Amino acid sequence: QDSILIIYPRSQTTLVQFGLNEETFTVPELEIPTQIYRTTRQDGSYTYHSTNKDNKAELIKPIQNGEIIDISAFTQFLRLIFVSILSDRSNIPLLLITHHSWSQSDLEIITQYVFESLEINNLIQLPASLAATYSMISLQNCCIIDVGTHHTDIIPIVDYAQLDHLVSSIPMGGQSINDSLKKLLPQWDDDQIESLKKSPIFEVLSDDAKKLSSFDFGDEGTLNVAEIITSGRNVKNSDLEFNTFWDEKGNEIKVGKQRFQGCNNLIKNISNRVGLTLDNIDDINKAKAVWENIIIVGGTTSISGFKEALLGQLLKDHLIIEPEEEKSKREEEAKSVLPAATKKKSKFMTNSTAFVPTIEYVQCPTVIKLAKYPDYFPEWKKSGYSEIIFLGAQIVSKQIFTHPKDTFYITREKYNMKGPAALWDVQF
Amino acid sequence: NRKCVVIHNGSHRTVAGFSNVELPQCIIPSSYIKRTDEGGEAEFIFGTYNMIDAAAEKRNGDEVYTLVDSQGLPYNWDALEMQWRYLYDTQLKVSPEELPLVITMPATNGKPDMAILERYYELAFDKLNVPVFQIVIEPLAIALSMGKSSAFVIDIGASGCNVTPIIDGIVVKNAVVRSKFGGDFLDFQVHERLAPLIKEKRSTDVWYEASTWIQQFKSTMLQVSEKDLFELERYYKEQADIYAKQQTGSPNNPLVQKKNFLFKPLNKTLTLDLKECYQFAEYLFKPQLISDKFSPEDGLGPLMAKSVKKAGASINSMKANTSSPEQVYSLLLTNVIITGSTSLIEGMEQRIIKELSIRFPQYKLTTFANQVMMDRKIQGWLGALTMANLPSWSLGKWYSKEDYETLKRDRK
């Protein structure tokens, strides 16, 4: 038609796009908080609904760290999404984006609730990683580092497939930046720290940017309250010692080296887990390919200088390259053949990272690159995870509409025949 | 009926997941870390990650133990219960009592241990209380999944080389041969030979090394020579000599080519020449070169030939059914399934082919080795998954004149 309901539930929000367009195609029309209010009846049976009854009803957050911690709350949340749909704008195909942590149990329950309760005829359960994959055509091997608030997912993909046994997460994310900043500024409150993290002047500096000027990175930042320069009732930020940012209460606050600190721990942990993860990819060439295509997404990653720092840490830790001391020894030894006055003029030059043949090793990676995004993204927001997931989901949609000969989704007929286990005959 | 839980406990790997997906849900180390805490509780730590993070913590209370002995059987059953509960609760995320369970036992020459079967029944039924439970023989499942009723399965793992001939779908028990020289052996030899180049609590560290740089060295630097390494040294030396003689590396002598490995812990280059890489794997074929218990007959070649001839002679205990020993040979040698992680080293299959052909000339050798590496590492689990999805076909029993005759005697 295409009237497709695409739902993408996350820990803290949920993106919903009703219908497909393909001309003036659109970003998610609806973004709602992932939550549902829940009351209890006389016998302990739960009544789920959209809004709290006065002050009395229990707020439930069905998704934590991308996982479904309460499946019933979640299903009811879907029901309320369809209510919230028909109320503004009746049989529509549902395309639900899934998370790697969701069990088979979870998925089967989702299927049974989608058919026997929501009474819709067509279901598609599409892994987020595979949607994101399909968004970028002809990209076969890659690794998704997705940094959330409380957790970071690492999702390696080989031959268009998610490697479930290598997929893991670490209990660190945006909030850990807040924690380490709090350790660096024990006097500030949490809102000022949060405002600092979201401020324009908050950026991770390159080792170039660190070495050039200022301060000296290796302590406590200051044992003093937040410096309030102003309040109410243009040169490189890297080069200034002190800089300014604004609070949510309308406070102009000065800040020092702390605006350059807070992400080291997170990126180091991430780099470790990534290292082990890709180290356990069985085929060497597939692993090489994966290393050449690194995807860094997540809200936290929109912080200025973050992605470059994570890539930098990946190279620092994991890149296979001749030790600088050895290479310099070979360079000097090779230069011994030159006349002493050519050697003389070669000494204080900026080295060409040259002359003699590089040492080739029998391991990967010798190359670590972020995967380059294709031309057709513009624009907001920072061409993130949401955008590519929805693009991929749209691609899948078109792919199954234009192929009537194939049925590559769950149908009411097939659900009637095999039950919820009909889900497993249609896998990406 | 809908899906099985499939679990394979190897001497190195544990593979787990539902039978309705081709790729396993988990592949973890069979080894685990036991941590006696300062909290007062005993904690179990499974998984390459987690175990590595813990080994990084360098806590004194941490000890790494094995779950499966060199025979492929479980020797620590409380820990095995803990691992199974880990897989069920935190990974597969399903109650054990909900679905059936399919596991793996290695092929054994003697009649199966009813001790460890009682242990399996006690674990599965009494503790985890799974509703239905089945055990499959690993190389047999592997043969069945490839549709080879007659198969010669050479499985080179971490424990050693397990050779299991199969004819008409029966394991042919007395022909089963297990070697002592596998990937663990190679781990040790790599550590020993590379020790001088590195030099100039503990168990978690030994593990950590075995699971990081040693593993990478094996998967990158180790190769098997297509023929006997000494003979090849002689051959390449002489060929190198005769081709420059018509009067800065040499193309006619591959054995002196420098190959470089980056040793991450010290961040220094380890350089070996191709011969020195060949040596490691060469120890598998000529074990006598390292030490003596080891007879040359403990090498892969003699063991393989031994298994073949043993299966041949043994098949006549069936009265031979034809009008045959050489025929069963041809049959085994024409269906050779090379599997196991260690079998992924660069020259393994060609060297196995050579070793088999020199000991069985005037025979047709046909070997099959999965070119998909991840698959070759988990082939047994894949086979188990295949058998798990089989229908419950009630196939008519065969019935011997003797099977009727002994009953006819028990009546009288």
Curated annotation (Swiss-Prot), chain A:
GO terms for molecular function: structural molecule activity. One of its GO terms (biological process) is regulation of DNA-templated transcription. It holds the Pfam family Actin. The keyword Phosphoprotein does not apply. InterPro entries: Actin (IPR004000), ATPase_NBD (IPR043129). CDD domains: ASKHA_NBD_ScArp9-like (cd10208). The keyword Nucleus applies. Keywords: Chromatin regulator, Nucleus, Transcription, Transcription regulation. Belongs to the actin family. Present with 1790 molecules/cell in log phase SD medium. This is Actin-like protein ARP9.
Swiss-Prot record, chain B:
Keywords: Chromatin regulator, Nucleus, Transcription, Transcription regulation. GO terms for molecular function: chromatin binding; structural molecule activity. It is found in: Nucleus. One of its GO terms (cellular component) is RSC-type complex. It holds the Pfam family Actin. The keyword Nucleus applies. It comes from the Eukaryota. Its main location: nucleus. GO terms for biological process: chromatin organization; chromatin remodeling; nucleosome disassembly; positive regulation of transcription by RNA polymerase II; regulation of DNA-templated transcription; regulation of transcription by RNA polymerase II; transcription elongation by RNA polymerase II. SUPFAM superfamilies: Actin-like ATPase domain. Changing residue 30 to F: Impaired heterodimerization with ARP9. Temperature-sensitive phenotype. Moderate suppressor of Ty phenotype. Disulfide bonds: none annotated. Forms a heterodimer with ARP9. Interacts with NPL6. Component of the two forms of the RSC complex composed of at least either RSC1 or RSC2, and ARP7, ARP9, LDB7, NPL6, RSC3, RSC30, RSC4, RSC58, RSC6, RSC8, RSC9, SFH1, STH1, HTL1 and probably RTT102. The complexes interact with histone and histone variant components of centromeric chromatin. Component of the SWI/SNF global transcription activator complex. Belongs to the actin family. Component of the chromatin structure remodeling complex (RSC), which is involved in transcription regulation and nucleosome positioning. RSC is responsible for the transfer of a histone octamer from a nucleosome core particle to naked DNA. The reaction requires ATP and involves an activated RSC-nucleosome intermediate. Remodeling reaction also involves DNA translocation, DNA twist and conformational change. Present with 1360 molecules/cell in log phase SD medium. This is Actin-related protein 7. It comes from Saccharomyces cerevisiae (strain ATCC 204508 / S288c). The lineage of its organism: Eukaryota, Fungi, Dikarya, Ascomycota, Saccharomycotina. The gene is ARP7.
